[PDB]
Every structure is written in C-alpha cells, then in structure tokens.
Design a protein around this motif. Sequence first.
Motif, PDB file in Angstrom:
ATOM      1  N   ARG A  47       0.861  -1.183   0.000  1.00 13.78           N
ATOM      2  CA  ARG A  47       0.000   0.000   0.000  1.00 13.78           C
ATOM      3  C   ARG A  47       0.896   1.231   0.000  1.00 13.78           C
ATOM      4  NH1 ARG A  47      -4.231   0.516   4.821  1.00 13.78           N
ATOM      5  NH2 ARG A  47      -2.239   0.080   5.891  1.00 13.78           N
ATOM      6  N   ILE A  48       0.966   1.931  -1.129  1.00 15.18           N
ATOM      7  CA  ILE A  48       1.843   3.094  -1.263  1.00 15.18           C
ATOM      8  C   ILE A  48       1.440   4.367  -0.551  1.00 15.18           C
ATOM      9  N   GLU A  49       0.398   5.030  -1.034  1.00  9.60           N
ATOM     10  CA  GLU A  49      -0.040   6.282  -0.427  1.00  9.60           C
ATOM     11  C   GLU A  49      -1.499   6.202  -0.046  1.00  9.60           C
ATOM     12  N   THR A  50      -2.028   7.302   0.468  1.00 10.11           N
ATOM     13  CA  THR A  50      -3.417   7.328   0.893  1.00 10.11           C
ATOM     14  C   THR A  50      -4.226   8.461   0.249  1.00 10.11           C
ATOM     15  OG1 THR A  50      -4.830   7.299   2.875  1.00 10.11           O
ATOM     16  CG2 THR A  50      -2.852   8.711   2.925  1.00 10.11           C
ATOM     17  N   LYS A  96      -6.988  10.962   0.252  1.00 11.39           N
ATOM     18  CA  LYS A  96      -7.503  11.731   1.390  1.00 11.39           C
ATOM     19  C   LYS A  96      -8.666  12.693   1.154  1.00 11.39           C
ATOM     20  N   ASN A 116      -6.836   3.667  -0.132  1.00 11.57           N
ATOM     21  CA  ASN A 116      -5.446   3.993  -0.464  1.00 11.57           C
ATOM     22  C   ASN A 116      -4.933   3.671  -1.883  1.00 11.57           C
ATOM     23  OD1 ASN A 116      -5.839   2.840   2.500  1.00 11.57           O
ATOM     24  ND2 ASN A 116      -5.450   1.123   1.104  1.00 11.57           N
ATOM     25  N   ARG A 117      -3.731   4.172  -2.190  1.00  3.88           N
ATOM     26  CA  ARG A 117      -3.066   3.948  -3.481  1.00  3.88           C
ATOM     27  C   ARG A 117      -2.254   2.649  -3.360  1.00  3.88           C
ATOM     28  NH1 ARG A 117      -0.813   5.947  -8.340  1.00  3.88           N
ATOM     29  NH2 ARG A 117      -2.674   5.672  -9.652  1.00  3.88           N
ATOM     30  N   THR A 118      -2.596   1.659  -4.183  1.00  7.56           N
ATOM     31  CA  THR A 118      -1.919   0.369  -4.179  1.00  7.56           C
ATOM     32  C   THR A 118      -0.910   0.252  -5.324  1.00  7.56           C
ATOM     33  OG1 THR A 118      -3.835  -0.679  -3.158  1.00  7.56           O
ATOM     34  CG2 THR A 118      -2.292  -2.127  -4.263  1.00  7.56           C
ATOM     35  N   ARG A 119       0.188  -0.436  -5.065  1.00 12.89           N
ATOM     36  CA  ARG A 119       1.196  -0.645  -6.081  1.00 12.89           C
ATOM     37  C   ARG A 119       1.444  -2.137  -6.169  1.00 12.89           C
ATOM     38  NH1 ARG A 119       6.873   2.144  -5.257  1.00 12.89           N
ATOM     39  NH2 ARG A 119       5.765   3.761  -6.450  1.00 12.89           N
ATOM     40  N   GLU A 134      -0.077   0.761 -10.578  1.00 13.19           N
ATOM     41  CA  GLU A 134      -0.652   1.376  -9.402  1.00 13.19           C
ATOM     42  C   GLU A 134      -2.103   1.655  -9.734  1.00 13.19           C
ATOM     43  OE1 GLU A 134       1.564   4.470  -7.133  1.00 13.19           O
ATOM     44  OE2 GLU A 134       3.227   4.115  -8.509  1.00 13.19           O
ATOM     45  N   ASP A 163      -6.173   2.858  -7.647  1.00  7.03           N
ATOM     46  CA  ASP A 163      -6.840   3.275  -6.423  1.00  7.03           C
ATOM     47  C   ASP A 163      -7.926   2.301  -5.960  1.00  7.03           C
ATOM     48  OD1 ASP A 163      -5.371   5.273  -7.664  1.00  7.03           O
ATOM     49  OD2 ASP A 163      -6.720   6.902  -7.100  1.00  7.03           O
TER      50      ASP A 163
END
Length: 306
Positions: A205-208, A210, A218-221, A237, A239
């Motif tokens: 799980r890379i980023e979120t 918001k 979250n942003r998945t890779r 990647e 969402d």
Amino acid sequence: PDREKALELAMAQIDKNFGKGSVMRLGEEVRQPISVIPTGSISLDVALGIGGLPRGRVIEIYGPESSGKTTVALHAVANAQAAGGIAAFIDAEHALDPEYAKKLGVDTDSLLVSQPDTGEQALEIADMLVRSGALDIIVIDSVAALVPRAEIEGEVGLQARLMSQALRKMTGALNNSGTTAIFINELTGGKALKFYASVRLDVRRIETLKDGTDAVGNRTRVKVVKNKVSPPFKQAEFDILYGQGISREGSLIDMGVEHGFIRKSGSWFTYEGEQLGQGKENARKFLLENTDVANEIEKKIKEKLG
C-alpha cells in the motif's frame, strides 16, 4: 556463426526443452495464447503483458496486511463469473465480507465457499474441486492458515511438504483444466509456491487518497515479480476506494494522462477540447457519471496497446 543467429537457435531450444518462456527478453512485446481473466485494473492488466491472469496457471498474490490482496483476487472472481464461470473460495481465515464482495461484482449466491478443518483438507477439497473441470478460478485465502493436521492436535512435518505435494499434483491438473488458481500469501510452504507459481504478484500500500475528509481508501502498487507468460518486473498502481473496490474510472485518468489522451492544464483535466474537472477526485466523479466518454478513453487505450 553469427551470435544473434546462434543465440536464437539455442534459446528456442530451451523453450522446447523447458517451456513457453523459460527464457525471455525483458524487451519482448510477445503476445499470444492469451485467454485471460481481467483483474479489473487496466494498469495491472498491461503490466501482466497478456492483459490478465493466465488461465490454467497457479498464481500467488502476496503482500502485508491491509494491502488489498484479497480485493484484487476478489475482482478476479467477479470478472471470471461475469463471463459465466464458476468460482470456488477455500476459506481458512474466515475474514470474507460478502457485502464488500457483492459490491465488487461477485455473485456471492452462486459462489462456492469452503472452510477446511486442516491444511490437508483444504488442499484436498481444493484439488478435488479443480479436477471436476467445472471451475474457472479458485482462490485459497492464506497460504499461512493452511496449517498441517498435527500442530492442530498437539502431536517436524512442516507445511513445506503439504504445499510441495499439493502443488506437484495440483499444478498439472489445472494445467489442462483451464482453471486458474489464486493463492493469497501474507508476510514456510511458500518456498514451493514460489517455484510453482507462473505469476507472483507483490502488493503493497503506497499512499493514501484523502481529500480533507476521512479519506476513503489507499493507493496500491503491484509489482509483478514473477511472470512466465510475459516479461517480468513491470508494475502498476491503482486506487482502491474504501468500501467500493478498484476505481476503474480513476485508472483511466492515470492511464489517460500517461498516454497523452488526456491533459492537465493547471490541474484541470480535459479530454480533447472538453474539460473534465479540477483535481483527480473531481475528474473521476465526472467519468463516474457519463460512461460513453470514459468508454471511448478505455476504447482508446485498448488500442494504443493490446
């Protein structure tokens, strides 16, 4: 004895001797055979090179917790079902949420579920279900949870074997059963799955996402670290909206701007003369309404590539 010439004669010898792509060229755009289950991610799809998880192959989706590993696997089930296919979920974690599932496209009513009582029983009722040749895709939740029979009743015989054997026998079965098998790993027996898998996916799980709100998901890779059907090491990647799944529309933008079909003048996305919105969340909300438009963009990227 020209090298480029020599090389090819040799190389081709190994595919014959060991397999389809026992030796690939990271560059190779080779594409054939196909027969793929879309993962629901245009980005992950191309990443796999054949546009989906190969059918008739053993596949491993690993990653830490709250990685969205099951979401990907569930999305697979959805598509495989959506095309009149039968799916089987071999539950050993008892974590499945049919509400989230059904909201992704899964026909839960017509979904075969099983909660083995042992690692053996799991891999048994799973290889048996495969041999019926009725299934299209089958997913086993948590390699981990597939604990040996002993180690359950007190009484050494590590799962290493349990996995090795079950795989040895089961790899050939679905090999000619056209039934793809997903294994969900979480960070033992995996020492074999690694070699048995034809495609191993690494989800993190890379980023979120918001937006000044509680923020959804979250942003998945996903890094495809092992691929025997196309060249490995590509990544994607996408969402995952909390309680909604993998955002198709969102993936069309990320992909759109990447392939020039869409532009961003001052964070103001627009598709050839007609603007969509300011910011991403607004640009996806747009595509979430009018589908023909998005349809074209999808119908436009599916051309730029396979």
